[PDB]
Design an enzyme around this catalytic site. Structure first.
Site, PDB file in Angstrom:
ATOM      1  N   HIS A  52      54.774  45.509  36.172  1.00  0.00           N
ATOM      2  CA  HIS A  52      55.954  46.359  36.287  1.00  0.00           C
ATOM      3  C   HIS A  52      57.228  45.605  35.921  1.00  0.00           C
ATOM      4  CE1 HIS A  52      56.793  44.770  40.464  1.00  0.00           C
ATOM      5  NE2 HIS A  52      58.022  44.889  39.979  1.00  0.00           N
ATOM      6  N   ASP A  92      48.955  46.047  38.711  1.00  0.00           N
ATOM      7  CA  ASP A  92      50.237  45.477  38.403  1.00  0.00           C
ATOM      8  C   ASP A  92      50.065  44.020  37.988  1.00  0.00           C
ATOM      9  OD1 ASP A  92      53.402  45.172  40.193  1.00  0.00           O
ATOM     10  OD2 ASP A  92      52.915  45.429  38.077  1.00  0.00           O
ATOM     11  N   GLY A 180      63.153  41.023  43.756  1.00  0.00           N
ATOM     12  CA  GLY A 180      63.271  39.708  43.132  1.00  0.00           C
ATOM     13  C   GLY A 180      62.026  38.836  43.248  1.00  0.00           C
ATOM     14  N   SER A 182      58.945  40.000  42.965  1.00  0.00           N
ATOM     15  CA  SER A 182      57.868  40.577  42.149  1.00  0.00           C
ATOM     16  C   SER A 182      57.279  39.661  41.063  1.00  0.00           C
ATOM     17  CB  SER A 182      58.318  41.907  41.527  1.00  0.00           C
ATOM     18  OG  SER A 182      58.442  42.920  42.517  1.00  0.00           O
ATOM     19  N   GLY A 183      55.972  39.769  40.839  1.00  0.00           N
ATOM     20  CA  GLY A 183      55.311  38.951  39.830  1.00  0.00           C
ATOM     21  C   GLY A 183      54.977  37.544  40.302  1.00  0.00           C
TER      22      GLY A 183
END
Ligand SMILES: *C(=O)[C@H](Cc1ccccc1)NC(=O)[C@@H]1Cc2ccc(cc2)OCCCCOc2ccc(cc2)CCC(=O)c2ccc([nH]2)C(=O)N1
Ligand SMILES: *C(=O)[C@H](Cc1ccccc1)NC(=O)[C@@H]1Cc2ccc(cc2)OCCCCOc2ccc(cc2)CCC(=O)c2ccc([nH]2)C(=O)N1
Lengths: 232, 231
Positions: A52, A92, A180, A182-183
């Site tokens: 995402h 994701d 912030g 994320s990933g």
């Protein structure tokens, strides 16, 4: 992989990390320098991060940072050759192939990938890291937190039909992943080595510390990762 | 109206829309040709868009665009004749200098009746060339499916900023974003796409866990149809 040259000493309500103690934590930044997601080095030429995040090859992988406000840090800005988005949101997960290898050092090295058969059982205290909000506000310095894995059954008690088998929930313990983050990585100790069990995906609109954050379940996705690495 | 010749197949974390499949969607571009807002063809002579888009007659309505990085598209750049603002609601109507030629890729969205009920939980669509990431702007039209919220749920996020003349949508993993303003929030009533919301405002960082806020077309459409017949 999995064993930082600089040993970790152990995100809302997290703690500041030992500089360089999470050498696989990369920051994903647009061409202007804006951090919009974290990521994790799995080797010299590959970064794993959230789908995402919408990473393109105009964005930059930054490895070696601790303080995003400092400029006295020996960091590396790595260009992105190719972008590999899981085509099964859903899952994701996204792989980034770097145009030139990352040079591994004290502060730059790789996280271990699990075997798809690996058992990181509910209740195991794992760690998540990143530059996400500490307060629902973006910290300059890399944050970390310890937090337990949830079983998917126990997770559905908060999130219902949303929690798919290829996801894993961690937290609900007084800490939480946040905007912030994320990933970025959720890692658990497996045979003395830090192994990527989650990719920070989603959670409470307010990063509530009493609600589980949701992560792409890496075991469920790792064959996809390997297939991608083999054909590239 | 509300029945695109090219059928839709189902903004941050949206998806690329099928070319020409939201034929009422227009780009609003300044005299330099820069895309600043969206809008919706409600007939060949009128576009509805957002008041906060500050549209003037120096701006331009572009119909029949999918990919603004493409030039092979048969697009119509339509001059604006007059801009009608709703006095005291984030809506503006544009009347065009020349009628818009209707085709497979250019046609009109349907308008609700003021008494229409679009209940919370309805899956609707918003579309636009707004940021896909908080330059992170797409050449190609984006679409996203998203649930209408009730106003009382919406106020859990936005409190007293939420007026009866607004409707909230999203907080569901997608988000309208900068550049989407003025464009459509549509829902499929009796099989036809009907303008239910006009992209207005919401999260300053385009948070996909924050509901977007849209001008509630039901509370505004009497003024729309009244301006049309009078003008
Ligand atoms: C990234 O930095 C940030 C991390 C984070 C973690 C925990 C708490 C808060 C923030 N993540 C987000 O901003 C994510 C991005 C995202 C992730 C997955 C995804 C879309 C967008 O696709 C999967 C969608 C399945 C989840 O879908 C929903 C839909 C609605 C709701 C939950 C899940 C209820 C609304 C809600 O709480 C929400 C909506 C989006 C996010 N939370 C979110 O965290 N987006
Ligand atoms: C337009 O392209 C853009 C689309 C969009 C949709 C959803 C989210 C983000 C972007 N819309 C905007 O940039 C809007 C424009 C706007 C619309 C109406 C309006 C002002 C500005 O006035 C009436 C609405 C009440 C304004 O209420 C607020 C709401 C929040 C805040 C202050 C005042 C906090 C800051 C914030 O989030 C903010 C401020 C402006 C916008 N968000 C915004 O979305 N502008």
């Amino acid at each position: 992989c999995g064993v930082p040259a600089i040993q970790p000493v152990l995100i809302v309500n997290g703690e500041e990390a030992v500089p360089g103690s999470w050498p696989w934590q990369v920051s994903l930044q647009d061409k202007t320098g804006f951090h919009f997601c974290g990521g994790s080095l799995i080797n010299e030429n590959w970064v794993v991060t959230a789908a995402h995040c919408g990473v393109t090859t105009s964005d930059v992988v930054v490895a070696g940072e601790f303080d995003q406000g400092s400029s006295s840090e020996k960091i590396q800005k790595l260009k992105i050759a190719k972008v590999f988005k899981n085509s099964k949101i859903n899952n994701d997960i996204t792989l980034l192939k770097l145009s030139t290898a990352a040079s591994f050092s004290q502060t730059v090295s790789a996280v271990c990938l699990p075997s798809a058969s690996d058992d990181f059982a509910a209740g195991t205290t794992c760690v998540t890291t990143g530059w996400g909000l500490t307060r629902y506000n973006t910290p300059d310095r890399l944050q970390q937190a310890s937090l337990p894995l949830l079983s998917n059954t126990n997770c559905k008690k908060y999130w219902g039909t949303k929690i798919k088998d290829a996801m894993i929930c961690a937290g609900a313990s007084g800490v939480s992943s946040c905007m912030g983050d994320s990933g970025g990585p959720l890692v658990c100790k497996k045979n003395g080595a830090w192994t990527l069990v989650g990719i920070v995906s989603w959670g409470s609109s307010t990063c509530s510390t009493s609600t589980p954050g949701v992560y792409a379940r890496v075991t469920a996705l790792v064959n996809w990762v390997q297939q991608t690495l083999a054909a590239n």
